Structure formats: C-alpha cells, structure tokens
Amino acid sequence: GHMGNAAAAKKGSEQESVKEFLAKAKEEFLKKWESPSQNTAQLDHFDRIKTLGTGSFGRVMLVKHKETGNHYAMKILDKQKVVKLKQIEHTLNEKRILQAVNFPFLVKLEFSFKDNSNLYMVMEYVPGGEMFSHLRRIGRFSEPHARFYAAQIVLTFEYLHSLDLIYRDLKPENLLIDQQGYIQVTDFGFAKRVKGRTWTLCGTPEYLAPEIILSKGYNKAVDWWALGVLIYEMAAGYPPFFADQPIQIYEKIVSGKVRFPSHFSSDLKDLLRNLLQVDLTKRFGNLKNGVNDIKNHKWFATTDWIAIYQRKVEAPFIPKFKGPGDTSNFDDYEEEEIRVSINEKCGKEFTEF
Amino acid sequence: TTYADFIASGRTGRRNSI
Ligand SMILES: [Cl-]
Fold first, then answer.
1. How would DSSP label each residue in A28-50?
2. What CATH code would you report for A36-129+321-351?
3. Kind of enzyme, top EC level (chain A)?
4. How much is the CA Rg of chain A, to the nearest whole Å?
5. CA atoms of A158 and A39, how far apart (whole Å)
6. Residues A256/A249, Cβ–Cβ less than 8 Å
7. Is A174 assigned a ligand-binding role in the annotation?
8. Do the domains spanning A18-35+130-320 and A36-129+321-351 agree at the CATH topology level?
9. Exposed / middle / buried, residue A263 (Cβ in 10 Å: 0-12, 13-18, 19+)
10. Cβ under 8 Å to A: B residues 1-18
11. CA of B15 to the centre of ligand 1 (A)
C-alpha cells in the first residue's frame, strides 16, 4: 500500500486525536453559544486613530484603548443602516459566533457594546492587511507559500465544520495576515449553523460553488469548493473562473471545465480537480473520509498539521510592521465623524447585541 | 494570455459580495 506500518499507525493516531480535539472544542463552543457575553466596554474607553475599511453598514477603525494602550480594530455598525439593509440577523449572528469560537486563525473579539446609534465589536488588530493586497502586489505565491496559507484554511474549516458552521465568505479580501505571517479570519456575516442543508444565495461570484449558482440546497461542501478557488488564485495570481460579467463567470463555474497555468505542479492540479469538482458525490471534503482526503493528499505531504496549528512553522512572508498601531498595510479612507444620537434608535431589533 | 484575459475582465480589484 502507500503507507508502511509505522506511517499508517501514526496517521491513524493523528486522525483519532483530531476527533478528540474537535469533540472537546464543540463542547466548549456550545457553552459560550448558549451564554453569550455582552456590554464589556464603552466608546470613551478608546481613542480613534484611523479608518481601516468601510462598507455599506459601517466602518472598521484602528483604536487605542486608553487604559491599556493596546490597539484594536473596532467595527462600527450604524443600527439604522443595518435595519434598512436587512442585515439584523447577520449582525447578531456574527457577534454570537465571534464570542463563542476559539481557534488560532479566527480573530478574537475582545469587547462589544452599543449606544443610541451604533453597534461596536472590538477585535484584535491584525496589522498585516488583507492577503488580497499582498497577492496582487507579489503577483502569485509559490506553491509552498500558497500551501502554508491553505493548510491554515483547511484546519479552520475542519474546526468550523465540526461546530456545524458553514463559512461561505472565503476570498483573499477576507483573510488578514498577522504580525507572525499567519492568517486571521474576521468576517462571519454569512456564516450559518447548518448540520444538513441550507439555501441562501450568498457569496462572491468568483468563489460561488456550482450548487449555489444552480439554486440547490447545499451543505458544507461549498466551503471546500471555495478552498479550491482560493488555492488556485493564490498559486496563479488570478482565480479559475473570471469574466467581464458575473453571468459569464457562473457559466464557467457550472461547466465542469477548469484550466491551469503550465507552472502548476501535477500534485496541485490533482488536488484542485478534486476540490473544484461540480459532482458532489466526488468532491473532496464531501466523501466518506471527510477532511482526511484533503489533508492526506500528496500536495500536502510536507505539511506538519500540528506544527501549523501550534504556529511553529516559519512563515514565508512577514508583513512590514514599524510598531504598534502601524497601518501601512491598509488603504487610506476619508475620516468621518462618529455621530451618536440623543435618542436610542432600533433598540428592540438589537436587544440581544 | 490568461493573465491578459484576467486584466481585460476588469475584475482585478476587491470583489464585493452579491
Ligand atoms: Cl480595489
């Protein structure tokens, strides 16, 4: 067979230990899920420094905690805009997930609170910026570099899926790089507890699995499809399916055809053909052997999964960091005031936040 | 080339959700 006795025994034991870890992690998650924490700080506890990002519902700002001097990333959501954009459930669910999960590649929520106007989630500041920026600047990542990031996503999805959480929002724009060069996942607006199937059309065109496009009930396998897209994009510099307009992207996604750069290794192409598999009965991550089909694939043969989890592997790339509060890896935005109303807005809708 | 096709797509910047 492919493994001799020692290697087979070691692999079997490793896989059983993963099961044991995940059972404990699920028990811990469910405790925090059933008893979420609230109201752990206030706005006047922080100095606002710079806007790190903006969206249709709010902003993320670099802030400095006055008492400790620690920097944090503060997501500010305008309650009235959240209601107008039909994002109440997503906002409450994101906070509930963030306060309940615990994993080295998932951002840590340190404080949350609300006022008359806004909701606030204060997260660890991840100073390396988005993977997206580094990828577009460098062009493409070499296979070992792509593999280092991919391994972290595999472990993170293995963790999330054990909690019955589907992620649904994977893309380089949503992956931040920390001071040690490891990945942080921050956005949970589309994540959902799904033991069986779910049906919502959500995601980003290039990263949508065929079954989402085709309006099917779908499961956690969409995240493994998205991993395939991510690995391809990291290693090529562009995603597998692109076009001027989303409709044409969707036609390519559902076609069952994918083409690869000539510099992709055969091991990489084999992995990608099994992740970017339109047939759900054949997609890696969706078979009887679960995540092990991915973790045991030849492309990952050099990956020490425990060392990645322990953050003991030297990162391929360390973002520039001139000190605490350095924002050089983020875009520049116009700075707007944080207006707080004299009257409470949308109190009922956000009572649980 | 495929890279040129990617540039031609106009979808080289940050991509929003649908
Ligand atoms: Cl952009």
1. HHHHHHHS-------GGGEEEEE
2. 3.30.200.20
3. transferase
4. 21
5. 31
6. no
7. yes
8. no
9. exposed
10. 2-3, 5-6, 8-12, 14-18
11. 8
Distance CA A49, CA A132 (A): 23
CA distance A4 to chain B (A): 42
Handedness of CA A173, A294, A289, A312 (dihedral sign): negative
Residue type (1 letter), A160? L
Task: Say how many Å lie between the CA of residue A17 and the centre of ligand 1.
Answer: 42
Cβ(A105)–Cβ(A152) below 8 Å: yes
Residue A215 C-alpha from the chain's centroid = 23
- CA-based nearest distance A150→chain B, Å: 20
In the residue annotation, A270 being an active-site residue is answered as no
Pick the CATH number of A18-35+130-320 from 3.40.640.10, 1.10.510.10, 2.40.320.10, 1.10.443.10: 1.10.510.10
Contact status, residue A36 vs residue A100, Cβ threshold 8 Å? yes
Q: Which residue of B has its CA nearest to A241?
A: B6
Q: Which residues contact A26 (CB under 8 A, 6 or more apart)?
A: A162, A163
Q: How was this structure determined?
A: X-ray
How far is residue A249's CA from residue A347's CA, in Å, rounded to a whole number?
A: 41
Contact A88, A350 (CB under 8 A): yes
Distance A138 CA to ligand 1 centre (A): 15
- List the single residue in B8, B9, B18 with the smallest CB-CB distance to A202: B18
Residues of chain A contacting B, Cβ within 8 Å:
132, 136, 169, 171, 173, 190, 201-206, 208, 236-238, 242-244, 246, 259, 261
For residues A206, A211, A213, A217, the Cα torsion angle rounded to the nearest 10 degrees is -130
Query: Residues A74, A60: contact at Cβ < 8 Å?
Result: yes
Q: Please state the length of chain A.
A: 353
